[PDB]
Amino acid sequence: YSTYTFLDLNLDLSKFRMPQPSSGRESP
Amino acid sequence: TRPTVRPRNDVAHKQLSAFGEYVAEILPKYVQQVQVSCFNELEICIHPDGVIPVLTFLRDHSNAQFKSLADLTAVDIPTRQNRFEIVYNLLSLRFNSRIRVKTYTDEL
Amino acid sequence: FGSLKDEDRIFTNLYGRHDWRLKGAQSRGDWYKTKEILLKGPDWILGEVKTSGLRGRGGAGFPTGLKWSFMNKPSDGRPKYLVVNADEGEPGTCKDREIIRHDPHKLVEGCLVGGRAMGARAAYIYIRGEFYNEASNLQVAIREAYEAGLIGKNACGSGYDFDVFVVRGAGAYICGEETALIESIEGKQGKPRLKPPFPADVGVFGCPTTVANVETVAVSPTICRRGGAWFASFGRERNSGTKLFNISGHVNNPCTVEEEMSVPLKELIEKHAGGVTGGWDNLLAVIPGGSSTPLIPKSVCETVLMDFDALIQAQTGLGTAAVIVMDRSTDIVKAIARLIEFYKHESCGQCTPCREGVDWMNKVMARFVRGDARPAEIDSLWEISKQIEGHTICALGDGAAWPVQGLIRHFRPELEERMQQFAQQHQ
């Protein structure tokens, strides 16, 4: 119900822990 | 199937499948291919050694009159290794039947 | 079917609609026996859904116990991922947006649990952006217990412990079918793939993934918990389970409810609580599904149960499980033309049957509600409905003729007098 505070969604906890990732390569 | 499609029949397709069959049976000397058209016509492919006697056989009989010579034509066909194609067309008077005689040849 | 129930009790798959909707301390149902479920092998969980036989309540069968075990390679060289849908593409479903409203912790359990059946790497979930206030609570639930170290990357008891990421669309369509969402999560426009490449667990994002619905993995913890011989308690031998229902249209309380398989519509709709239209002695044209199940009139459908095959014994099945009626005030052809009007604004545009074939029907259905010229236009309209079933790709091609063809049945003078009245009006 708050239009802002997506950094609470994105950058607060999901940036502190991803984890890890390894994410593969796929360079290509 | 519908209107505006030609209604074919099977009675004339039966007897012309019947009549021309025993023609090759009684002269297996000259006849090399017989075929029935899907619209009641007949071809009797003949090597031209028997150009005279097969006509002479259809000249007279008691089961085949065929004395109305209507059409002599000539059709060329290149890429056949024997070019030309003499084709007759004769008519039975008493029986109302059409049959053609396809005889190939070459030039010389 | 059993004893025609399908009752409503507390022994369901819901924690509480009113208990606590924010983040909490996982009091009763959430995280009860956490490490003991994943300590068993996947072969304990593979085939455990066969004890349930959950067909998947998205609108089609092909049960989740089969698509997770079978059509699943072990590994070749590339990872696997999980796609848990959450968006509602059908009109008037509302089965979602209430699960995330008060039960955020239940879904996070079956994510790692259902992924353990596949052995996939991570968990990607997709929510509509327009459900914006409710989606903010979802990351708060990630802040509640996932950020409390309960999950990931070794919690608990084993090395298998992973994450969950949240994405949002804008105005999308890939709720309605899979293999477009795995395309749209890359960044392409959303024009879905062909259906047999290599289907979705062979050819996916860069590597084969799985796609499930909400309750395809939301009931997965508790069906692994209570088990039985209880998941097949209602219904016949074909279908099994207890699904959430939703009631709209003309009723005293348009609301959700909980029932199970094989309940007839005369007792199912009129209970909980009122039938505010003519509950009888009205027309009461019922719609069994969201949109792909057409009108059924006041005949024996009300005594026909809600089995998958019972509506297959009727003219059209329904797995979306939506209830809307049209009794007295609603004109029949007026409402359904607005349903056809709807599909112009959500068709993709790939298939030449779908594109330019829907707006064939759009321009003619607006001609019938107006009331217009001579008949036999109905049959030409009926042949177009008999011309788009299996030519397109997605089920929208099936979702475009089924409301039309079911209107051709059961209603011959729906407009045979109305369009004659306009023909009487000009004459």
Place this chain on the structure above:
Amino acid sequence: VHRDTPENNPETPFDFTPENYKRIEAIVKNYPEGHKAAAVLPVLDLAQRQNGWLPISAMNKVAEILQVPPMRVYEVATFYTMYNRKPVGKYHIQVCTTTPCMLRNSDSILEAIQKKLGIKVGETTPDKLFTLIEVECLGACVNAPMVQINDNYYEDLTPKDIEEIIDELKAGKIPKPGPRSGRFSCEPAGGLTSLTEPPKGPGFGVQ
């Protein structure tokens, strides 16, 4: 309507917030690298968040940020619904007319809005900031023909709320982000209780 840009603002320009450049690092760390390559759905949404409506130079800004061809940006924002290209207002409001919402008498939550406000159908306000359109398929047809706003939803719309939600927003209030009346949680109403208890002996998982 038409979907092109005949060159009014080719370069507005537009820049991002220094608070918002660091948020990209959370976004890029999500995707598997190499095939990451396109995070255009939250990012161009965040550009809509900073500006409100974005120009064509705002489209060209992010193309150098994520090394895609800039033609592959025009494909996205001209497809979806919530992205905007034309200039918009402060309050974007939506009448959720759907076919079961039609059955809940959407005609009442149709006009008597334009007469109340002074605008045209499907049209922005002539003054500043009210823009009114109509949408479909956002959850509850089980509620009234409800009203969507910029960050919430107004369940249980009614002609009193037509005299309220238009009225309170002209004054600058926040008219009840949810069900303003009736059932606050959309409960079964005769089955809303369902014997609220602990769920009958958890611990069946021997199996």
Place this chain on the structure above:
Amino acid sequence: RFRGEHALRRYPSGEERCIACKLCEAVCPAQAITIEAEPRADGSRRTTRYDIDMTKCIYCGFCQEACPVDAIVEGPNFEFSTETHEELLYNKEKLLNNGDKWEAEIAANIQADYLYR
């Protein structure tokens, strides 16, 4: 429905009803038609050379029944018989002039016969 002299029609105030779609050429049995077209500077295509070999013309009239925009019309006037072979080859600036010695003769016969065909 009597056939005769060739002529060309045009719209209300002059437009060259011909669109040079070449169909009258491909069905002429004597190939009396020869047309070279070109984009005129306004943009719409028109003709440059337009010929009817009135010697060769065998009057199958299929040109009248092949034009979609109904351009060429067999005008019903048997006024003929010049004195050279060099004259009867009609160029374009006979035919528009010959189509504009009269039109009310032509425009009434089409309007009394177009319902049948």
Place this chain on the structure above:
Amino acid sequence: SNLIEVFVDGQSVMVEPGTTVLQACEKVGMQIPRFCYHERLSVAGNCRMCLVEIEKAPKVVAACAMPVMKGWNILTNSEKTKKAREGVMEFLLANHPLDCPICDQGGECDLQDQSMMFGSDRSRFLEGKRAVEDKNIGPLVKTIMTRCIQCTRCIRFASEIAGVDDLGTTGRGNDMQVGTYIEKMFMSELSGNIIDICPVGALTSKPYAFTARPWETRKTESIDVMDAVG
């Protein structure tokens, strides 16, 4: 070795395990109609014209993008396939204007050599016919984007061999378009070589534009000498 005998109309032929139904049926000397397909391009399927009724199945599949399993009976002419090739090529012949007196591909368009052989007899639409607007790109490509049956064939060529990433798809549903959103010109090497690829006469040559129809020419093969590769 490494083959499956598939009875194409009840007649055996051995293909590689992993080829297409189109190349199988084209090997035995047949033509299935081709709109969303090209051999020298990639493979999509969004025209849905090739539809063959496979035996022992109630459904109909398209021969563009699917492999071939253990030997089927690819029933080419059926009493249902002709209920499909009539079917799809009735829709796309409606939302289209009445050109070809003036359409410059008027002797070779593939709505004109398919529509006699396949397809229906009359029309039942009977009003409609949306009409989009056109634009200009370069001084070589005469541009009528109205006709544009959206077979996605010029579109992939920008991602194909000519590597200029310039074109796209703008729109949804009935209303989508093909041209560039901005007025950027498109010209490089091979840039005039799209007007062969466009299978209808929506694209054509600018200097050639209004000259002559293609049933009067005399096709004589030769070689050009303006480069060393011939």
Place this chain on the structure above:
Amino acid sequence: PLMGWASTADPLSNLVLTFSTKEDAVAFAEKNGWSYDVEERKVPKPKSKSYGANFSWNKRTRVSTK
């Protein structure tokens, strides 16, 4: 020089026949006996085309913007 027609000499200039194959192609040019020259039939590659490999994990064969 009266119309600009393509009047001409070269009395043959339009003679195309329909042959069956390469075998009797030569045999007709020699049977009447004037000089000639023969091209060769070109059949293309079969070729290897397969959808599904247009979505890669590490390859280059990958389509976009469809």
